[PDB]
Amino acid sequence: PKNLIPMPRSRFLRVKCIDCGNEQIVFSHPATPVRCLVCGATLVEPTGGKGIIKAKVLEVE
Amino acid sequence: ARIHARKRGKSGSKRPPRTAPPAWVEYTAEEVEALVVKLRKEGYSTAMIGTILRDQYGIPSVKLITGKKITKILEENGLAPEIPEDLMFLIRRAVNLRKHLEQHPKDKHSRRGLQLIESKIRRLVKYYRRTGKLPAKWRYDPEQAKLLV
Amino acid sequence: TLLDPLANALSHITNSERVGKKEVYIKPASKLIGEVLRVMLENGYIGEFELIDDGRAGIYRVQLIGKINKAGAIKPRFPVKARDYEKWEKRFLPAFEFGILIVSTSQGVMTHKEALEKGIGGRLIAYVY
Amino acid sequence: GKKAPYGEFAGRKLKLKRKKFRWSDIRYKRRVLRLKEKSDPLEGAPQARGIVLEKIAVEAKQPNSAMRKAVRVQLIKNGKVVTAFTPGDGAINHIDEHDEVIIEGIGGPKGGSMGDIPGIRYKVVKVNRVSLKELVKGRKEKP
Amino acid sequence: GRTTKVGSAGRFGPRYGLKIRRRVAAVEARMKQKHVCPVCGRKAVRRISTGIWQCQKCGATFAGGAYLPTTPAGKVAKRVTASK
Amino acid sequence: MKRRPRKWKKKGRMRWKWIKKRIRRLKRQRRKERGL
RNA sequence: CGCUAUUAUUGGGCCUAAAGCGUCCGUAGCCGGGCCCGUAAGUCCCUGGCGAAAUCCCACGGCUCAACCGUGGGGCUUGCUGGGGAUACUGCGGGCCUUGGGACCGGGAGAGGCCGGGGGUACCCCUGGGGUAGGGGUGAAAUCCUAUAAUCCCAGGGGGACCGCCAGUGGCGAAGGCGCCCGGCUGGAACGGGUCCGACGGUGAGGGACGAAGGCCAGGGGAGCGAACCGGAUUAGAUACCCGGGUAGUCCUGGCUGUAAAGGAUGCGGGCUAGGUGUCGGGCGAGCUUCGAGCUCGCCCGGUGCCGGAGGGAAGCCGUUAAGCCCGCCGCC
RNA sequence: GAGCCUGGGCUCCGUGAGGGGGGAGAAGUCGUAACAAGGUAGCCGUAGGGGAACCUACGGCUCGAUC
Ligand SMILES: [Zn+2]
Ligand SMILES: [Zn+2]
């Protein structure tokens, strides 16, 4: 068949913070800065389009 | 197309046909509601609440997880705005423009923007009167609107 | 903007048939469109229409076989009595029994032949030949 | 663009549109406002009586060349003066001044003049209650 | 304001002509309104005499034009002397 | 004025702008003649 | 009356033949996305009371047949009204949805607009130094400037307008229109978005706002150009074309005028009917890299061009940026 | 409450010494504006001028030919 049902190109990620080893679910195309809930450090800087990841990706949901 | 500019842009969201929430969602409804209330108390709007839940907590389509919307969650408490948010954003834009134009009379290209903003406000007023979210005699007037913001 | 989706469905079918397509997609679905496709299939103008579920509305996938010359919606939806079908036949069709006039009644959507058997009238919506 | 209006509940505007754009036709305008009646010296009649004043001759239009004989006629209905053509060969000889004359239309596009002689609209039918055709053919004698 | 075309020149009726009445009305309508003070910044400046202007609130008293507190040459002199 | 764009063609005709200029002078004279 | 689809509901036209308001905002009106429940106003069926006769259609009968007259069956009277039944469509009332539309966040593009500050050459005049007889202009000449020292070169002072090449087949804007650099205030659009609202929409008579040049009013300024005008030439004549001068105006501040081949000579919204090759913006993915906000290739969205099959058209031509097939609204012939 | 007089309101026709442009008809006189790059490319808007077609200036369009 055809691609008539529009499906998203973005995905959710399970990343791990280097400092404290906390695992966290986050969005791939963010519009705000994403911070470690525990430490407070930034894991994903926002851009136009896809965001830059500053952590280790474990799973891509 | 755009109501004024008539340009056929398509830069929106592509949501999938979900009915049930996914399994990899950690939080539950009772936590999501508290998160909403807290982010509201810290002065955020509904759109930003949703954006933050999505980006930082991994909560897609709050309505899926909690069977109701954000404005419903906030009305169930004493936190919902008296004037809808679109109207207030537009009214703030209009107030700021009138301030600018009092100092810049002959700009003459932002007065048209002011006209367009007021047309949008009038459309929304006509809608909200019918739906009942405003009294049926509510009128926009910049004089009295200076105090709303 | 979008005012009438049945008209668009029928015009799309007409053009695709004119230029020789096998399948066609009708994006905003509706029960009127479903019933009209049912009547067309019963009378042998199409084959094997299916409904697909995207979270917005229904989509209709229709197969074509090479039997439609012209298909169109009737606007305005004129009311018609049981003793006045000949005028509209002569106005919309090319021969005394050639094609179908689709009528909405209080008993359902049907062809004018069945509606005449039952002895009732209704509203004209579509024609096919 | 599609032709408007076309909706089921839009008959008022249709009727107004047709009424408006019908005034651009000259037939309807003239018939309704009654202009021919206001500008006609025969006052809506197919014939009329008159009294002669002067014989004359009109030069034909190019590329033809000839002199058509005509006569100025004063009408008894209203006193207005018109010009009438005398058909036939020698017709102008069987007409003197102060003779009574019956006038008809000459026959032309839009109830007007004919080909070679523009400016004239009427022709003579009778002279002192006798047919000019009979006069010309010699089957009669005028009193 | 009962009049459509005439203003302060309605005082002397159909006399003296159109151009002259228009000019008088224009000048007087520009003059008699209130003006901004160069000291306090409020619209309270009126004329006292030919060339002498006074604010009512602060009491500022300055010299200026005959029918308006400023002149073009005055503006240009102010600018040029401020720069150089 | 309301202008017919056919008039601007030059075939059997004098130039439309000059014709318009000639028309605006005659109006001037006629109204003066009445004295209104 | 028809002919006449030259009044077009059926059933007409608006690039060039008559015809799209200069552009936009919006009032009435007309047209309005999908699902569920109810009502039964519109709508359909059945039955009661009315819509005089003559006139119209058919059959039979009487004057020889017929025209005519009589008997009976239908129709006409553009329809009104009393009840019963139905609920697909429209309307009315109440809930739900997110595709159309609006709001918000992010990183970027752009001569979009206003204000202030700083400059760049060139042109005109004035003051000094040098030099000496022509300069300017034309098809050819003359008026004109010049020994009170011109044209030309050098050093300085002042003034007014405009912003070259880069510059594009480019961009922003509703149109008109917008090009030196820096800073502040401000309008809109595209892209990306499991963000928010939940049909809030289209068009728009009447009304309103903006709107090249030119002209008018009031006040300032005025280098160059230049209607009017003054001269010199050409010419049979020259109220013109060419040459030398030159007022209003062209600039700024505040108003009026509301007009253009204000032209894509093509009104606006939505859906469908092969594509190819260029270029601007954003995004994704591959490769190179002097590691640069860098270069090449492909794909998605949006703008902006050139070709072209089917198709359309009187043709010229148009041809997914239709002048093709459908759903709407205004203006005009 | 007729009729008479009287003062006004509206509107169609009636008649008038004499002036202005318009249209046909003969084609008479002065020039040569337009069609070719028509011999100064043409046309729109505004303003000034001229025996006449027309000239000039600012802004615009190509329905403009050539290298
Ligand atoms: Zn951490
Ligand atoms: Zn003061």
H and E: helices and strands count for chain D: 4, 5
Beta strands C108-111 and D67-75, pairing class: unpaired
Beta strands D81-85 and D122-127, pairing class: parallel
Q: How far apart are CA B58 and CA A15, in angstroms?
A: 12
The gap between C53 CA and H18 C1' (Å) is 93
Distances (CA, A) of E15 to E4, E9, E10, E20, F21: 18, 10, 10, 10, 38
Spatial contact of A13 and A53, defined as CB atoms under 8 Å apart: yes
- On chain G, which bases lie within 7 A of the protein's CB atoms? 6-10, 12-14, 17-20, 24-27, 29-36, 42-46, 85-89, 97-108, 112-115, 173-174, 185-202, 209-211, 218-221, 254-255, 260-261, 263, 265, 267-274, 282-285, 301-303, 310, 324-331, 333
In three-state secondary structure terms, D137 is: helix
Q: Residue C71 burial by CB count (10 A; 0-12/13-18/19+): exposed, middle or buried? A: buried
What backbone torsions phi and psi does residue B126 show, to the nearest 5 degrees? -60, -35
| Residues D82-92 as b or e (16 or more Cβ within 10 Å = b) | bbbbbeeeebb
Nearest Cα neighbor of D50 from D12, D28, D31, D78 is D78
Nearest CA in chain A to C55: A5
Q: Do chain B and chain C touch with ≥3 beta carbon pairs under 8 Å?
A: yes
Identify the H or E element spanning C105: strand C100-105
Q: Using the CB atom, is residue F20 less than 7 Å from strand H?
A: yes
The gap between C119 CA and G213 C1' (Å) is 74
Q: Which two tokens stand for residue C117?
A: 């058997």
- Say how many CA atoms lie within 13 Å of C92 toward its Cβ: 23
Chain C residues with CB inside 8 Å of D7's CB? 76
In three-state secondary structure terms, A14 is: strand
DSSP string, chain E: ---SS-SGGGGGTT-S-HHHHHHHHHHHHHHSS-EE-TTT--EEEEEEETTEEEESSS--EEE--SSSS--HHHHHHHHHHHH-
Tell me the technique behind this structure.
Answer: cryo-EM
- For C97, residues 6+ apart whose C-beta sits below 8 A from its C-beta are none
Q: Residue B96 burial by CB count (10 A; 0-12/13-18/19+): exposed, middle or buried? A: exposed
Please, what sign has the CA dihedral across residues A24, A25, A27, A32? Answer: negative
Identify the H or E element spanning D8: none
Nearest-Cα distance to chain C for B17, in Å, is: 4
Q: How far apart are CA D82 and CA D53, in angstroms?
A: 10
Nearest-Cα distance to chain B for A2, in Å, is: 16
Q: Using the CB atom, is residue F5 less than 7 Å from strand H?
A: yes
Contact C25 A4 (CB under 8 A): yes
**Per DSSP, which regions of D10-120 are E strands?**
47-59, 67-75, 81-85, 100-105
| DSSP at A24 | E
In three-state secondary structure terms, B119 is: helix
Strand G and chain B: which residues 102-141 have CB closer than 7 Å?
104-113, 115-117, 119-120, 122-124, 126-127, 131
What resolution in angstrom units was achieved for this structure?
A: 2.7
Q: How far apart are CA E68 and CA E45, in angstroms?
A: 11
Q: How far apart are CA E44 and CA E58, in angstroms?
A: 9
Nearest Cα neighbor of A10 from B58, B45, C56, B66 is B58
Q: How far apart are CA D103 and CA D49, in angstroms?
A: 6
Beta strands C71-73 and C100-105, pairing class: unpaired
Nucleotide with smallest C1' distance to residue B62 CA:
G194
Q: How far apart are CA A32 and CA A52, in angstroms?
A: 12
Q: How many CB atoms lie within 10 A of CB B87?
A: 21
Q: B81 — contact with chain A (CB < 8 Å)?
A: no
Dihedral angle, C-alpha B120, B122, B125, B126, nearest 10 °:
-110
Q: Which two tokens stand for residue B77?
A: 């408490």
- For D20, residues 6+ apart whose C-beta sits below 8 A from its C-beta are none
β partners of residue C60: C26, C51
Q: Which two tokens stand for residue B45?
A: 């709007």
Identify the H or E element spanning C58: strand C58-63
- Chain C, 70 to 129: residues with Cβ < 8 Å from chain B are none
β partners of residue A57: A15
Measure B29 CA to ligand 1 centroid, in angstroms.
Answer: 25
Q: Is A30 annotated as a binding residue?
A: no
Spatial contact of C91 and C49, defined as CB atoms under 8 Å apart: no
Distances (CA, A) of D11 to B6, B48, B93, C91: 32, 51, 44, 21
CA A58-A16-A43 angle, to 5 degrees, is: 115
Q: Using the CB atom, is residue F29 less than 7 Å from strand H?
A: yes
Cis check: omega of the bond before D5, within 30 degrees of 0: yes
Spatial contact of C50 and C91, defined as CB atoms under 8 Å apart: no
